[PDB]
């Protein structure tokens, strides 16, 4: 079989540097269009990140800072966005799919906060 549960298409570090790279852009710009699948990878990861930020203690900040290497973006998620999602049962990030693309026929999409 192969009844596992995750995705790659890169080695072990690339797949981690991406999910971190998108995690950050998503949080730094509230929205980003990306390959449909990549957004799918991103979504859960990021939601987790918003939930770690959603604690306010230094510990929770320091943890987020492990997957958000930009001081400015951490402050945002830490002080602006995490506090805002206070009352929603971690469930906000939505993906919209757009049209297929020209250079490679790949269907792009939107993942927005």
């Amino acid at each position: 079989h192969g009844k596992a549960g995750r995705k790659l298409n890169r080695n072990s570090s690339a797949r981690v540097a991406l999910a971190r790279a998108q995690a950050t852009a998503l949080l730094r710009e509230g929205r980003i269009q990306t390959t449909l699948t990549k957004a799918k990878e991103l979504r859960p990861f990021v939601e987790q990140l918003i939930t770690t930020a959603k604690g306010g203690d230094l510990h929770s900040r320091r943890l987020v800072a492990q997957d958000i290497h930009d001081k400015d973006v951490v402050r945002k998620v830490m002080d602006e966005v995490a506090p805002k999602y206070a009352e929603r049962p971690g469930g906000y990030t939505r993906i919209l799919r757009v049209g297929t693309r020209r250079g490679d026929g790949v269907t792009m999409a939107l993942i927005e906060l």
């Binding site: 049209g99 297929t100 020209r102 026929g105």
Partner: protein
Amino acid sequence: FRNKKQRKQQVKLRKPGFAVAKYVRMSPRKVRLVVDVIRGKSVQDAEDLLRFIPRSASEPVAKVLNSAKANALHNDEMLEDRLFVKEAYVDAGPTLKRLIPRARGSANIIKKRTSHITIIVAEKGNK
């Protein structure tokens, strides 16, 4: 009648709802795929299906289809909302033979084909 020679002059010979992109740098066989979903329908649909169909042959077929339309309409004073792809097809124009290197000295020729995409629009109607 008269005889051939007089005919040629009494007449000019025209092509209703007809356009044709000659020498499109694609493979006939490749373009045909797209030209095939569009054959025989509401020139509207053709406009529509092309916008979405993923093959990169779609643009050219698009362009020819809206040129054959801009004719049926103009040079033919046709009623666009009865227009429908009467006929469409793809023929091969010249072929751009190009040489490519291969392993151990030998060489090869890549055939970069080309196509003449022509499409003919015509008013439909039942009766």
